[PDB]
Design an enzyme around this catalytic site. Sequence first.
Site, PDB file in Angstrom:
ATOM      1  N   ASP A   1      10.694  19.299  -5.352  1.00  0.00           N
ATOM      2  CA  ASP A   1      10.161  17.954  -5.414  1.00  0.00           C
ATOM      3  C   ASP A   1       9.140  17.634  -4.328  1.00  0.00           C
ATOM      4  O   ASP A   1       9.472  17.300  -3.180  1.00  0.00           O
ATOM      5  CB  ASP A   1      11.353  16.978  -5.324  1.00  0.00           C
ATOM      6  CG  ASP A   1      10.950  15.539  -5.590  1.00  0.00           C
ATOM      7  OD1 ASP A   1       9.737  15.244  -5.642  1.00  0.00           O
ATOM      8  OD2 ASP A   1      11.860  14.705  -5.760  1.00  0.00           O
ATOM      9  N   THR A   2       7.866  17.729  -4.696  1.00  0.00           N
ATOM     10  CA  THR A   2       6.792  17.483  -3.737  1.00  0.00           C
ATOM     11  C   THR A   2       6.668  16.007  -3.401  1.00  0.00           C
ATOM     12  O   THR A   2       5.976  15.674  -2.446  1.00  0.00           O
ATOM     13  CB  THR A   2       5.415  17.949  -4.267  1.00  0.00           C
ATOM     14  OG1 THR A   2       5.194  17.325  -5.546  1.00  0.00           O
ATOM     15  CG2 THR A   2       5.425  19.457  -4.439  1.00  0.00           C
ATOM     16  N   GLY A   3       7.298  15.168  -4.211  1.00  0.00           N
ATOM     17  CA  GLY A   3       7.362  13.733  -4.017  1.00  0.00           C
ATOM     18  C   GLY A   3       8.414  13.255  -3.026  1.00  0.00           C
ATOM     19  O   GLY A   3       8.504  12.055  -2.715  1.00  0.00           O
TER      20      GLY A   3
HETATM   21  C1  LIG Z   1      14.408  11.740  -2.480  1.00  0.00           C
HETATM   22  C2  LIG Z   1      13.672  10.998  -1.370  1.00  0.00           C
HETATM   23  C3  LIG Z   1      13.495  11.900  -0.155  1.00  0.00           C
HETATM   24  C4  LIG Z   1      14.359   9.695  -0.991  1.00  0.00           C
HETATM   25  O1  LIG Z   1      12.312  10.641  -1.812  1.00  0.00           O
HETATM   26  C5  LIG Z   1      12.096  10.075  -3.022  1.00  0.00           C
HETATM   27  O2  LIG Z   1      12.918   9.551  -3.761  1.00  0.00           O
HETATM   28  N1  LIG Z   1      10.774  10.219  -3.314  1.00  0.00           N
HETATM   29  C6  LIG Z   1      10.142   9.805  -4.550  1.00  0.00           C
HETATM   30  C7  LIG Z   1       8.729   9.298  -4.228  1.00  0.00           C
HETATM   31  C8  LIG Z   1       8.707   7.786  -4.077  1.00  0.00           C
HETATM   32  C9  LIG Z   1       8.273   7.212  -2.899  1.00  0.00           C
HETATM   33  C10 LIG Z   1       8.236   5.832  -2.781  1.00  0.00           C
HETATM   34  C11 LIG Z   1       8.607   5.062  -3.861  1.00  0.00           C
HETATM   35  C12 LIG Z   1       9.080   5.616  -5.032  1.00  0.00           C
HETATM   36  C13 LIG Z   1       9.126   6.989  -5.135  1.00  0.00           C
HETATM   37  C14 LIG Z   1      10.045  10.908  -5.607  1.00  0.00           C
HETATM   38  O3  LIG Z   1       9.562  10.375  -6.839  1.00  0.00           O
HETATM   39  C15 LIG Z   1      11.416  11.584  -5.871  1.00  0.00           C
HETATM   40  N2  LIG Z   1      11.282  12.555  -6.948  1.00  0.00           N
HETATM   41  C16 LIG Z   1      12.369  12.575  -7.913  1.00  0.00           C
HETATM   42  C17 LIG Z   1      13.706  12.767  -7.177  1.00  0.00           C
HETATM   43  C18 LIG Z   1      14.871  12.672  -8.149  1.00  0.00           C
HETATM   44  C19 LIG Z   1      14.908  13.469  -9.284  1.00  0.00           C
HETATM   45  C20 LIG Z   1      15.953  13.365 -10.180  1.00  0.00           C
HETATM   46  C21 LIG Z   1      16.979  12.469  -9.925  1.00  0.00           C
HETATM   47  C22 LIG Z   1      16.936  11.653  -8.807  1.00  0.00           C
HETATM   48  C23 LIG Z   1      15.882  11.763  -7.914  1.00  0.00           C
HETATM   49  C24 LIG Z   1      12.442  11.336  -8.798  1.00  0.00           C
HETATM   50  O4  LIG Z   1      12.830  10.235  -8.417  1.00  0.00           O
HETATM   51  N3  LIG Z   1      12.074  11.529 -10.057  1.00  0.00           N
HETATM   52  C25 LIG Z   1      12.124  10.482 -11.074  1.00  0.00           C
HETATM   53  C26 LIG Z   1      10.777   9.788 -11.207  1.00  0.00           C
HETATM   54  C27 LIG Z   1      10.694   8.663 -12.236  1.00  0.00           C
HETATM   55  C28 LIG Z   1      10.155   9.166 -13.566  1.00  0.00           C
HETATM   56  O5  LIG Z   1       9.607  10.294 -13.534  1.00  0.00           O
HETATM   57  O6  LIG Z   1      10.307   8.501 -14.608  1.00  0.00           O
HETATM   58  C29 LIG Z   1      12.564  11.067 -12.413  1.00  0.00           C
HETATM   59  O7  LIG Z   1      12.194  12.178 -12.805  1.00  0.00           O
HETATM   60  N4  LIG Z   1      13.335  10.243 -13.134  1.00  0.00           N
HETATM   61  C30 LIG Z   1      13.798  10.700 -14.447  1.00  0.00           C
HETATM   62  C31 LIG Z   1      15.159  11.384 -14.305  1.00  0.00           C
HETATM   63  C32 LIG Z   1      16.295  10.536 -13.778  1.00  0.00           C
HETATM   64  C33 LIG Z   1      17.171   9.913 -14.643  1.00  0.00           C
HETATM   65  C34 LIG Z   1      18.223   9.149 -14.181  1.00  0.00           C
HETATM   66  C35 LIG Z   1      18.428   8.996 -12.829  1.00  0.00           C
HETATM   67  C36 LIG Z   1      17.551   9.608 -11.940  1.00  0.00           C
HETATM   68  C37 LIG Z   1      16.500  10.371 -12.417  1.00  0.00           C
HETATM   69  C38 LIG Z   1      13.865   9.590 -15.480  1.00  0.00           C
HETATM   70  N5  LIG Z   1      13.564  10.065 -16.703  1.00  0.00           N
HETATM   71  O8  LIG Z   1      14.164   8.436 -15.222  1.00  0.00           O
END
Ligand SMILES: CC(C)(C)OC(=O)N[C@@H](Cc1ccccc1)[C@H](O)CN[C@@H](Cc1ccccc1)C(=O)N[C@@H](CCC(=O)O)C(=O)N[C@@H](Cc1ccccc1)C(N)=O
Lengths: 99, 99
Positions: free
Chosen positions: A25-27
């Site tokens: 996760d580069t984010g």
């Molecule tokens: C983890 C730490 C160190 C706290 O940093 C971040 O969360 N950074 C975020 C950057 C950010 C900075 C400031 C504000 C907002 C965001 C990244 O997006 C984190 N990357 C992944 C980490 C992750 C992956 C999976 C589970 C939990 C967490 C993420 O949230 N990805 C989301 C982004 C939103 C999106 O892409 O729609 C994702 O793929 N969400 C999916 C999967 C999912 C489902 C249910 C719950 C959690 C995740 C979704 N379809 O909703």
Amino acid sequence: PQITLWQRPLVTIKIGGQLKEALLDTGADDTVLEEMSLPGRWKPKMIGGIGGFIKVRQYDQILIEICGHKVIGTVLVGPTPTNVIGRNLLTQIGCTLNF
Amino acid sequence: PQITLWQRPLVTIKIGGQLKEALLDTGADDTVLEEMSLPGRWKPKMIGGIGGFIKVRQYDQILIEICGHKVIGTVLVGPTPTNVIGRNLLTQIGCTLNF
Ligand SMILES: CC(C)(C)OC(=O)N[C@@H](Cc1ccccc1)[C@H](O)CN[C@@H](Cc1ccccc1)C(=O)N[C@@H](CCC(=O)O)C(=O)N[C@@H](Cc1ccccc1)C(N)=O
Ligand SMILES: [Cl-]
Ligand code: NA
């Protein structure tokens, strides 16, 4: 070597004697893992993402092997839905983005 | 280009006639932007991350210029603390992870 992004960039990690899967996760600034047993002295932390904030235990100087690549760094442990490998460890394994 | 991860991988984007900064996030399935007007049809959606879930507006077939690379794809708009470019658009610019 080189990983495309048509699918989630999931890798195998070995940490604390345990085998897990984790997302590259580069984010993410930090590495955050689901609840697990890490020996040593940790410190309370709070981190944020999309959605809001969670409390984690900060473990420093923890060995983790990512794709058979040994790195030593901070690992946060807490109620994350998935294991995330963040930039703090992605740098140590020499990871880049390319396009 | 190649981008290391010692720093957050922030890039400039052009969308809806506006210039913004966004984070290249391999951990994101989707692309999620802070509030902004986009035209045309949209569908309600919920998405989740580290701290919980948010409600977003889904827009399809939207032109985004990412580092001078034009892509057309779905963009979610909502209450994210940061503009995130997710894998749905990273693939379209041919982005990979390497180590
Ligand atoms: C983890 C730490 C160190 C706290 O940093 C971040 O969360 N950074 C975020 C950057 C950010 C900075 C400031 C504000 C907002 C965001 C990244 O997006 C984190 N990357 C992944 C980490 C992750 C992956 C999976 C589970 C939990 C967490 C993420 O949230 N990805 C989301 C982004 C939103 C999106 O892409 O729609 C994702 O793929 N969400 C999916 C999967 C999912 C489902 C249910 C719950 C959690 C995740 C979704 N379809 O909703
Ligand atoms: Cl570290
Ligand atoms: Na850290």
